[PDB]
Design a protein around this nucleic acid. Structure first.
Ligand SMILES: Cc1cc2nc3c(=O)[nH]c(=O)nc-3n(C[C@H](O)[C@H](O)[C@H](O)COP(=O)(O)OP(=O)(O)OC[C@H]3O[C@@H](n4cnc5c(N)ncnc54)[C@H](O)[C@@H]3O)c2cc1C
Ligand SMILES: Cc1cc2nc3c(=O)[nH]c(=O)nc-3n(C[C@H](O)[C@H](O)[C@H](O)COP(=O)(O)OP(=O)(O)OC[C@H]3O[C@@H](n4cnc5c(N)ncnc54)[C@H](O)[C@@H]3O)c2cc1C
Ligand SMILES: Cc1cc2nc3c(=O)[nH]c(=O)nc-3n(C[C@H](O)[C@H](O)[C@H](O)COP(=O)(O)OP(=O)(O)OC[C@H]3O[C@@H](n4cnc5c(N)ncnc54)[C@H](O)[C@@H]3O)c2cc1C
Ligand SMILES: Cc1cc2nc3c(=O)[nH]c(=O)nc-3n(C[C@H](O)[C@H](O)[C@H](O)COP(=O)(O)OP(=O)(O)OC[C@H]3O[C@@H](n4cnc5c(N)ncnc54)[C@H](O)[C@@H]3O)c2cc1C
Lengths: 286, 286, 285, 285
DNA sequence: TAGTCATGACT
DNA sequence: TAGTCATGACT
DNA sequence: TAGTCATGACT
DNA sequence: TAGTCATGACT
């Protein structure tokens, strides 16, 4: 058997950041993710704008930004917001979700049982189960499939799409508001790629290719690529993901049973919300 | 183990000056600085103008100038201010930040622990930790990451920029006022380089390349170099740095625990307040 | 110093129907109503279409129609419903709300107190209080202002309007559906008047003259009176009223405290529910 | 030698409503108000919009509206908001502040002394003092000059102005957004007067004639009267007032000493929060 | 005394 | 949210 | 299948 | 504060 300090279930932004924070504070951590489709972290750009996250309180952002700048590096980007300019914090999403410091098993967690020395995680098709003292369940919108709670009763999914163009760079990165609580954001996510999203947040059963095409046109029109059929040519990739939401939430970080944590509910401002949860977990586990 | 009389954390203006003042007082001193980007001392000119610093009081600027002249040499510069002339005190920043009398470990202080005698400076990646009877933390705007206090709760950063032209000298060194509390200052910092800065002090998150360009255009126009593309030609270097600022302080010099000092907040009038604090450390550390 | 068998608070359809039923069952009954505006019975047509009331069950609608036909008389009207025809039961609202067998005090009930003998109905501006062994509070959407049970906590109002044109008669009476659960109804409510309504049920606070005029024009178009400026001529009278509604209840008929009953929530299907609740009150009092 | 049940200091909205509520609950109440300028009730329109007051909770606003409609009458007004319509509750300010049921001494309360039977209210320039078992201080922004609790330590003023045009009526009453979270409100406060306000709430010491003219022009433009020179023609009256505000409190209703109450802090949602505090005072005195 | 720069509330 | 006021500090 | 209405969340 | 999105009961 595998016996470690911490097992993190889920390797999206929340499970990645929480595990690496624990590993970089000295703990032995192992991750498990079944790479299921629809994960909300795949389309993420990891943009963190003060205006979007200030509702948290200085008690929460600066703890988060220090963790991210220390562990990953927070680069600041200035976006064209109208004629004025606004600065947005950024972590490279490929850097967070690609970091390999914490080993990650590509298995599906089937059960979570407590033992004398702590918790035991069961995996489909494996009579063996992993074991650790502390377990973090950061399974996004699927967290209510492994952990139960009152807060976990409000867990719902709000899906969205982002588009990444290859071999392209924007001379001006922008945030263009088009509706209440909705803004089209375009920027260079890589030195060779452009990411655009309009903030659409819809229940996955109400999402469809036609509603996705409306968001493609809004995003494509904003970088003047509408009309060229870039999707069918393989020049743009459409990125779909389900964001976890629990009304009445920055996110849900609750010790459901002694030693078993649930981390989900990050909705829109997730990278910053994950840093807080990681700061709090390294504070409460170390 | 390393065991010394004094360990100074930080080798910007404050830690360089304090360490060297303490060494010249007979003490065995060692320094630790991780050369993280954005330090507020790198764009510094070390100009000390009485109209700017006399708010300090004769009780403080006079010991400060005596220390600085004894250790480094205070040269006087005659500046053109409009139709008048003003003399500004100066120390060569290359001489203060380059002095090698105090050896400096290029490491990151991770913790400061008390031991039976003295303090233990813990460093990333080193199972061994440094030790001295007294520790001075001159970590600028990061001082509150290692030391905690009531005063240190107001520690903030005020960023600014200066421009250093290569292979150039000014026939007239000048101070040209452009706004309340604001003046553009140009002079020869070296026999081959011209330094210009406008005094802009912004919260680092509100700084951007467009905000920097207003300060470049102001500074270039002051030496008739705007329009010639000196930046893209590599003829001028832009120097960005974060000043440590605390509302309500010449600077902050406080013994947080017996033998543990915090030294920061020297945003306004830094070299002169650093000379004062160093004069005080020489008197109060045995 | 007045002491009777039953005091019925509220003289709308439910309080009128229950009081008169109790009076004819032998009991000495008196009513109290402050004639406050917005009462839900004023626009009422007392139309009862089987399709609308069948959900309650024959165990309830059959007693109600028996009580109503005994006391008031139930008439059948044939309505044009599309290409088909349908029969609707009817009681004259002027006969139910105008009946004088039970006298009615025109005062506002301010409180309901228990006494050695029974319940005491306190009246605004009068130190004397009315007294009866039983009190039935049929106060429409205001019943929760005098009785404070749990069920009455969901009591809300669903407002609507009906229009009565004067000196007019319809050769064809109709139920013409225009949206899900919504139909415009025109018929002869009197031998000299036409009554029209579209079934709109809006929260009273979200009601306004623009929304009322949308219901007027829907109703005028249904009787070919749009274009004639009937409103500015004073040819049509607008009748606004708040229906009492409680989710999960034909209506609420509950003895909250001994001898103290709450009767409300009859939303749409009020006359048939009022006949039912009165049948039970005649049995239980 | 005046001795009553309750003495209410302050005759703006909070003391007016509380005094009249206590008087109608059987208590003998008198008021004292020195008619000092800058009171926050003079520019008041007594508009109560659910979107603004629901943060209070049904447990407070519904009791409050029941009291106001019982004592004064709550009218509903439909306002044009954008292309939509919204309902706002209303009480006539002339009815609340002009009611004469509770007599009001026009004197300045200079001190509050405890006596064996109750509290003694001293009046400037007057040797004798009034006395009552309970005293409510509803002194708006000056309440902390007579009661010195810790909560009253945050009592500050938020000034504003409203404009009443004479011999004018609006065909459409409106709430027009002019910035995020800022709206100009226009309506007919009387059958012969139009009231307009823009909701400006400023530290009283930063108010001046120039800043007032900015609100006059915003309000005049909103009713298409900019350019007619209504101010210098005497056709519009400017009404300046200080709202009492305490950060962290619907309003402050506290029994500071046995029988001595403080009632203030109703800057946002004043008439409705005064209705709530009055319901509680009738319950607790 | 002014312009610069920041912070907070938000019918 | 975003976007507009309001308020205050401060080579 | 559908059209109201109402009620709240919402970088 | 406005448009977008969800939910639920309904002559
Ligand atoms: C269009 C779009 C744009 C976005 N933009 C931004 C942005 O600008 N900035 C930002 O910070 N965030 C952004 N996000 C991210 C947003 O914050 C999401 O809420 C965030 O990705 C939540 O990630 P998570 O780790 O909570 O969930 P997920 O990424 O869904 O992680 C859950 C993981 O759990 C695994 N898992 C679940 N159940 C099991 C199981 N039983 N066994 C094993 N593994 C399991 C899944 O495989 C998955 O990898 C964006 C998202 C979208 C869709
Ligand atoms: C544009 C500009 C112009 C200026 N002009 C002048 C001028 O004309 N005259 C003047 O006197 N001053 C000037 N200054 C300087 C100003 O006074 C600054 O306040 C001063 O440099 C502050 O220096 P410091 O030593 O406190 O901070 P810093 O120089 O930032 O020193 C802090 C040091 O600590 C190190 N450090 C931090 N944390 C750790 C850790 N955990 N472990 C190890 N090392 C650590 C950092 O690497 C850094 O070197 C200017 C500054 C700027 C930006
Ligand atoms: C547009 C429209 C169309 C309708 N069509 C029909 C139809 O076709 N068929 C049908 O059967 N019904 C119809 N109705 C009526 C509907 O069924 C109502 O639900 C019914 O009228 C409810 O009546 P109620 O007696 O329960 O309430 P109300 O009629 O409101 O009676 C309550 C009475 O209590 C009084 N009251 C309240 N508080 C006090 C107090 N403190 N003191 C004294 N008195 C007090 C009020 O003055 C009022 O008179 C219609 C209603 C409307 C608005
Ligand atoms: C521009 C504007 C618009 C408004 N619009 C509305 C609206 O739409 N709806 C609404 O409900 N409200 C509105 N208000 C009112 C707001 O709610 C006020 O906060 C409210 O009027 C406060 O009432 P109060 O009774 O506490 O204070 P005030 O009316 O100020 O009453 C205090 C009274 O105390 C008296 N007093 C004080 N000290 C003494 C003393 N020592 N001796 C004797 N008398 C004394 C004063 O003379 C004064 O009469 C508005 C106000 C303004 C300025």
């Amino acid at each position: 058997s595998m016996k470690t300090d911490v097992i993190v279930v889920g390797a999206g932004l929340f499970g990645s950041i929480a595990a690496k924070a624990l590993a970089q504070a000295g703990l032995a951590v192992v991750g498990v993710d079944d790479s299921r489709p629809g994960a909300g972290s795949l389309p993420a750009a990891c943009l963190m704008k003060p205006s979007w996250f200030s509702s948290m309180g200085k008690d929460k952002f600066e703890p988060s930004l220090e963790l991210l700048d220390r562990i990953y590096g927070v680069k600041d980007i200035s976006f064209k917001v109208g004629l004025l300019r606004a600065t947005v914090h950024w972590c490279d999403p490929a850097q967070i979700l690609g970091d390999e410091e914490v080993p990650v098993y590509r298995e599906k967690v089937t059960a979570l049982t407590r033992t004398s020395s702590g918790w035991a995680v069961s995996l489909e098709g494996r009579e063996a189960a992993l074991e650790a003292r502390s377990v973090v369940v950061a399974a996004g919108v699927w967290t209510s499939e492994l952990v139960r709670s009152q807060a976990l009763g409000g867990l719902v999914g709000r899906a969205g799409v982002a588009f990444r163009w290859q071999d392209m760079q924007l001379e001006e990165q922008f945030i263009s508001p088009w509706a209440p609580y909705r803004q089209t954001v375009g920027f260079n996510i890589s030195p060779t790629e452009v990411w655009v999203g309009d903030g659409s947040a819809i229940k996955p059963e109400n999402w469809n290719q036609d509603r996705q095409n409306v968001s493609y046109s809004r995003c494509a029109q904003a970088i003047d690529r509408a009309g060229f059929g870039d999707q069918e040519a393989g020049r743009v990739k459409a990125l779909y993901g389900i964001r976890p939401y629990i009304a009445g939430v920055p996110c849900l970080l609750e010790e459901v049973e002694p030693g078993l944590w649930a981390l989900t509910g990050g909705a829109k401002n997730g990278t910053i919300s994950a840093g807080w949860a990681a700061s709090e977990l390294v504070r409460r586990i170390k």
